[PDB]
């Protein structure tokens, strides 16, 4: 069940902002084909999650002056019917056009009709240009759209940056869902660290990938889910009941040890035997009601003194970033440059080893590519209500005591409160204390 008051406020917000996006689009057009679980964070899908809290496959949504048009099946139109009355009073009329797959002539007429309304709004049409969906609905739609662009002289422009700004600031309910997600990540991290220690202690034959898979699979263990429920349900926003079915993975858990450390988002657990010495990097990111979170911990197994000392600096760095650097009003570039400067002042020798970013805005997407915390983004300001995956590390560090280089990585989900007087709030709280992440065999 969909909160239509939320649907109404979010669609009205988008409607009020879009003509002021870059390029001044006269209309917006969002076409969703079949859902793909392996590619869940495209802008059109994000829009559906934001507006409705569910992805509606084989559905078109258009915004033009005065109207929101939804082309979808009878079943789906029935889920959305109650929304219509909300716009009866508003610049928007809501219109639900129902498809019928035994009437392909009607289905074509609907598509021609919406393109006519788009044409009437103006020549500039805003779409998320990187989005790609497959399936039967898209096979119908694609040639109709392509003909319209070519025949009507549509100027089709990207709106990803505009969308990113519209839904950037998290409302109080969204903040709650992010908190729930993050607590989930904490509890899986706790499991992960326990299973990892057991693996080393019991001399298990197990690869990094197999161990991370074990943790991933616990999301389907209803016994484990039951255990999770008290702590997660306490964090749900007022009037929203905790629901198991809304728990998912943002991405596959990762464990790294031994020969290979990769600090980029593209990293995946290797098929190498779990290496029970030195640095073990682990990352879990649970998703609750579409709200992504992330946590990365480094575990130290019989660490040399230099690994331990560099781990201490890693903690100090995170405290400096979150307490002093990551402030409303600042650009990602300014934040990242400030980080480099701090490292340059304290441990200059480690600058070449540092990650190229310190994470990104997080929310309905795991990583908003228009708000990565690196030097390339000089065009966004941090705002109160923003939530971040603050993730950084040092790779290719030299161990005098081992044949393997080592790495250190730390990530937490951090909320910037809406209230001016409140500091950044860690949503992920699983320990990072050196004595609690160090193990000796």
UniProtKB/Swiss-Prot annotation:
Annotated localization: Nucleus; Chromosome
Coiled-coil blocks: 202-228
Membrane-spanning parts: none
Family listed: Belongs to the peptidase M24 family. SPT16 subfamily.
Additional facts recorded: Present with 18500 molecules/cell in log phase SD medium.
Role description: Component of the FACT complex, a general chromatin factor that acts to reorganize nucleosomes. The FACT complex is involved in multiple processes that require DNA as a template such as mRNA elongation, DNA replication and DNA repair. During transcription elongation the FACT complex acts as a histone chaperone that both destabilizes and restores nucleosomal structure.
Oligomeric and partner information: Forms a stable heterodimer with POB3. The SPT16-POB3 dimer weakly associates with multiple molecules of NHP6 (NHP6A or NHP6B) to form the FACT (yFACT or SNP) complex. The FACT complex interacts with the CK2 (casein kinase II) complex subunits CKA1, CKA2, CKB1 and CKB2 and the components of the transcription machinery CHD1, CTR9, PAF1 and CDC73. The FACT complex interacts with the PAF1 complex. Interacts with POL1. Interacts with SAS3. Interacts with YTA7.
Identification of the protein by name: FACT complex subunit SPT16
Biological source species: Saccharomyces cerevisiae (strain ATCC 204508 / S288c) (Baker's yeast)
Gene that this polypeptide is encoded by: SPT16
């Amino acid at each position: 069940n969909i909160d239509f008051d939320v649907f109404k406020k979010r669609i009205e917000l988008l409607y009020s902002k879009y003509n002021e996006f870059e390029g001044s689009p006269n209309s917006l057009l969002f076409v969703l084909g079949s859902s793909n679980a392996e590619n869940p964070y495209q802008k059109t899908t994000i829009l559906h999650n934001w507006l409705l809290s569910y992805e509606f496959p084989a559905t078109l949504i258009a915004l033009v002056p005065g109207k929101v048009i939804i082309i979808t099946s009878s079943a789906k139109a029935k889920h959305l019917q109650k929304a219509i009355d909300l716009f009866k009073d508003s610049k928007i009329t809501l219109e639900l056009w129902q498809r019928n797959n035994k009437e392909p002539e009607l289905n074509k007429k609907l598509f021609d009709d919406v393109i006519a309304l788009i044409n009437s709004a103006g020549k500039t049409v805003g779409i998320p240009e990187k989005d790609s969906y497959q399936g039967k609905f898209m096979t119908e739609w694609n040639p109709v759209w392509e003909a319209a662009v070519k025949e009507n002289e549509f100027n089709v422009i990207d709106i990803s940056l505009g969308l990113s700004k519209v839904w950037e600031v998290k409302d109080v309910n969204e903040q709650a869902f992010l908190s729930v997600s993050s607590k989930g990540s904490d509890k899986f991290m706790d499991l992960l660290s326990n299973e990892m220690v057991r693996a080393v202690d019991e001399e298990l034959k197990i690869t990094n990938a197999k161990l991370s898979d074990k943790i991933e699979n616990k999301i389907d263990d209803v016994k484990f889910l039951k255990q999770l429920s008290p702590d997660l349900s306490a964090l749900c926003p007022p009037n929203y009941k905790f629901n198991f079915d809304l728990l998912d993975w943002t991405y596959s858990p990762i464990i790294q040890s031994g020969k290979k450390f990769d600090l980029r988002v593209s990293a995946r657990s290797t098929n190498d035997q779990l290496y029970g010495n030195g640095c073990i990097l682990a990352s879990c990111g649970i998703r609750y009601n579409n709200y992504c979170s992330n946590i990365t911990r480094t575990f130290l197994i019989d660490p040399s003194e230099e690994m331990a000392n560099n781990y201490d600096f890693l903690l100090t760095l995170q405290k400096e970033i979150v307490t002093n650097i990551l402030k409303p009003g600042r650009t990602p570039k300014e934040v990242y440059e400030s980080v480099i400067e701090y490292i340059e002042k304290t441990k200059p020798e480690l600058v070449p080893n540092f990650t190229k970013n310190i994470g990104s805005l997080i929310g309905l997407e795991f990583r908003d590519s228009n708000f990565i915390l690196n030097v390339k983004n000089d065009y966004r300001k941090i705002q109160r209500g923003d939530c971040f995956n603050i993730s950084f590390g040092f790779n290719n560090l030299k161990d005098s005591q081992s044949a393997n280089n080592y790495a250190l990585q730390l990530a937490d989900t951090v909320q910037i409160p809406l209230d001016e007087t409140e500091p950044p709030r860690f949503l992920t709280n699983y320990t990072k204390a050196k004595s609690q992440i160090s193990f000796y065999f």
